[model samples]
Target: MDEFEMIKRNTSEIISEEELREVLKKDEKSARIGFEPSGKIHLGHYLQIKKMIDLQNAGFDIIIYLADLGAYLNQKGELDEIRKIGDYNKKVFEAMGLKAKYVYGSENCLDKDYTLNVYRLALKTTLKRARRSMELIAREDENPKVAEVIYPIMQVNNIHYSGVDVAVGGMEQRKIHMLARELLPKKVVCIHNPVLTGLDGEGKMSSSKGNFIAVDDSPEEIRAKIKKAYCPAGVVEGNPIMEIAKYFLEYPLTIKRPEKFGGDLTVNSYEELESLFKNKELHPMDLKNAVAEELIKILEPIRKRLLEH
Candidate 1:
C-alpha cells in the first residue's frame, strides 16, 4: 500500500482526509499519539504501535507522547510510579519496532510557553465540555476533581506542543481529539483506531483486568488464554479474536486447523473470514486455535526481543 493508504488502514475514523492529503504534500509530515502509562504492554498497545510504524515507513515523523502527568492527574498514581511505567512502556514500544521521539508529559508540558498556551485553553474551555472529553478517559470518581478538567486542556495543548501533523489514538479519545481539532491554533488531522474488547468478551482489552494478551506472554500462555477465550461460532460482532485477525493478520491469512474443521483453508482477507464464520461455515474453536497459533508465531519473536531490555 502507498503512504496515504498506510495511514488510512485499520483505522476507525479520520477527522479530515483532506488534511491528510495536505500533510502528504509536505516533505516531512508528522504524527503523534498520547498514552497514560499504567499497565503492561499488550496487543491493544501493539495495534497503535504498528500504526505509528506504518506512519514512519510512510515518511512521517512520529512522536509518542507518554502522558505520565496526565495519568497522575487522572488518578493513576504518583508521578514517580507513573514515570516508571512510562519508562518501561517506552522500551516495550522500541522492542515492538516503533521508532519515534518518546516524550514525557511532565518535562515538556510545564514549560513557560506550553503553560501559557494551556492557561489560554483553560480560559476558553468550559468545565462541562472538559468533563465530557474525559467521559471515556477519567477514572470513575463520585466527586470529580479539578485534575480531570486540567487533563483535557493539557492534551489539547499537547497537539500544539508535540507539533505533529496528525494525532492518533483509540476511539475513546474522540471527544478529546475533537476538542483539540476545534481549539488548536493550527488544526491537526485526527486518526482513531478500534479498541479491542477483552478476550472474554468483557470490557476493553486492559491489563488491570487481566483480560489482555500481554506483549511478553509465553506462546503457551497465549494458547491457553485463547483456548479459554470467549469466541462463539457464527458470530463476528464483538469477537476479540476476530478483531485481532482483521487488524494483525495479513491477506491470505493461513488457518492451520484440522481437516474435519474445514481442512485448514486460507482466507483471502478478513471479510472472507467474517463471511464464512457468520454463515456458520467456520467454527469458533477453529478460528480461535488458528489465531492462537498465529499469535504465538507473531508474538514469540517480540517476546524474545523484549526479554533483553
Candidate 2:
C-alpha cells in the first residue's frame, strides 16, 4: 500500500483528513501513541503498535509514549510500580520490531512548562467535561475520584508537551483527544483505531480483565484461547475472531476444513470472509482454526524474543 493508504488502513477516523494531508507534506514531523502501562502486552496493544509502524514507514518519526503517571492517576498502581510495568512494556514493543523514540510520561510531567500548561488547560476545561472524558478510561468509574478529572487535564498537556504533530489511539480515547484538540492553542491531528471486543464479547480487550491473548502467549495457549473465544455463528459484527482476521491476517485468507465438511476455501479479502461468515456459509470452527494458526505464526517470533532472560 502507498503511504497515505498505509497510514489510513483499518483506522476508524482521522480528525480532518485535510489537516492530515497538510501534516503529511511537512519534511519533518512526528506522530505518537501513548499507553498507560499495563501488566501484559496483548493483541489490543499490538493493533496500535502496527499503526505506529505504518506511520514510521510513511515517513513520520514515531514516539512510543509509556504513560506511567497517567496509569497512576487513573489508579492503576503506584507510580514506581507503574514505571516498572512501563519497562517491561517497552521491551515487548521492541521485540515486536517497532523502532522509534521511547518516552516515559513521568520523565516530562514534572517539568516547569508542562506543569504550568496542565494548570492552563485545567482553567479552560470544566469539571463535567473533564469527568466525561474519563468515561471510557477511568478504572474506578463507579464512585470516581478527583484524580479522575486530573487525568484528562494531564493528558491534554501530554499531547502538547510531547511535541508530536499527531496522536493515535483506539476509539476509547476519542473524548480525550477531542478535548485536547479544542483546548490546545495549537492543533494536533488525531487518528482513532477500532477497539476490538474481548474474547468474552463484552468490553474491549484488556489485560486487567484477562480477556486478551498476550503477544507472547505460547502457541498452545493461543490455540486454546481462540478455540474457546466468543465467536457466535452467523454473527460477524462484534466478533473478536472476525476482528482479528480483519486486522491481522493478510488478504486471500485461507480457512482449512475437512473434506467431509466441504473442504477448504480461500477468501480474496476481509469483505469476502465477512460476507461468507455472516451468511453462515463458513463454519465457526473453520474460521477459529484458521485465525488461531495465523496468529500463532504471527506471534511466534515475538514470543521467542520475549523468552530472552
Candidate 3:
C-alpha cells in the first residue's frame, strides 16, 4: 500500500488532507514523527515505534523527538536524569530495528529559537485554551508547575522550528499538536494516534505506575503480567487486554479461539475483536492469554537486541 493509505488506516485521527498533502509536497524525501521521553519506552511507545517503522518503510525520514525538557519537569526537577531516559528510549528504537534519527537535550536546539517559538504559540492561543489543554496535569495532587505549562508550548515550538513536514504523537498530545498547527505560519499536518492501555485493563498505560510492560520485558514476564491482567468480559470501556488486542494486534489479521475450550471463534480484525469482546463471545482469560502470546512474540527479539546493545 501507499504511504498515505497506510497512514490513513493506522492513524485514528489526523488534522486534514490538504494539510497532509502540503506536508507531502514539501518533504519530497521523508516525513518526521516525534515522541516524548518522559518514561521508559513501554508497550504503548512500542506501538508508536511500529507505526514509525511502517512510515520509514514507506520512504519517510523518521524524526524521534525525545522531550528531555518535559521529562526533567515531570521527574521533579531532575534535569540530569532526562538524558538517561532519552538514552534508554534511543536504545529501544535501535532494538526495535528502527533507523530513525533523534534529537534530544536542550543543547541540540538553540535556546533562543525554542523560546521564541513558545512565546509565538502562546500568543496565538488564549489563556483559557492553554489551561483547558492541561487539565489532566492540573488534576494531579502535585499541582501544575510552571514547567508543565511550558512543556506543551515547547512541543509546539519544536514542530515549528524543526522544519519537519509531519508530526505524530500520542492522543494525549492532541491539544498541543493542534496549537502547533494553529501557530505555524504555514499549514502543518499532525497525526494523533490512540494511547495504549495498561496491563491491569484500566487507564492509560503508565511507566511511573508499573502498569506498563516494556519492550525489553522477558517472554516469561510478559506472560505472567498478562495472566494477572484485569481483563473482564462484557466491560468494553476500560479493558486493557481488549485495548491491546484492538491496537497492538496487526489489522487484517484474525485471532482464532479453539472450539473445544469454548466454541470456534474468529476475529478477522480489530473491530471483530471488539465486537466479540463486547458480546462476551471471547472470555477475558482467552483474550488476555492471546494478547500475551502475541506481545511476547513481538518483544522477544527486541529484548535480545537490547541486551546486546
Cα deviation of 58, candidate 1, in Å: 1.3
Model 3: per-residue lDDT, tens digit, 147-266?
A: 566666776777766676777877777787777777787556777778777766667887557688878878887888888878777887777777777667765654556777666565
Candidate 2 to native Cα RMSD, angstroms: 1.2
Best TM-score among the predictions, by candidate number: 2
Model 3 alpha-carbon drift over 4 Å, by segment: 25-30, 75-77, 109-111, 120-125, 137-143, 250-266
Checking candidate 3 for backbone clashes, the offending pairs are 30-61, 201-240
Better of 2 and 3 by lDDT: 2
Itemize residue pairs with steric clashes in candidate 2.
Answer: none
Tell me the TM-score of each prediction against the true structure.
0.96, 0.97, 0.87
lDDT tens digits, residue span 1-309, model 1: 678788899899988998888988999788999888957788898899899998889888999989998899989888999999999888888787777898899888568988998889999899999988898886588988889999998988888888888999999999999899888877888889989888889789975565788888898888898888889887778999899898887778877777765577888999999998898888888888888888888887788888884
User: What's the alpha carbon RMSD for model 1?
Assistant: 1.3
Query: Any idea how many clashes model 3 has?
Result: 2
- What's the distance in Å from true for residue 258, model 3? 7.0
Query: Which runs of model 2 end up more than 4 angstroms from their true locations?
Result: none
Superposition error at 230 for model 1 (Å): 1.3
lDDT of 2 at 286: 92
Local distance difference test scores for all models: 0.87, 0.89, 0.72
Residue 129, candidate 3: C-alpha displacement in angstroms:
2.7
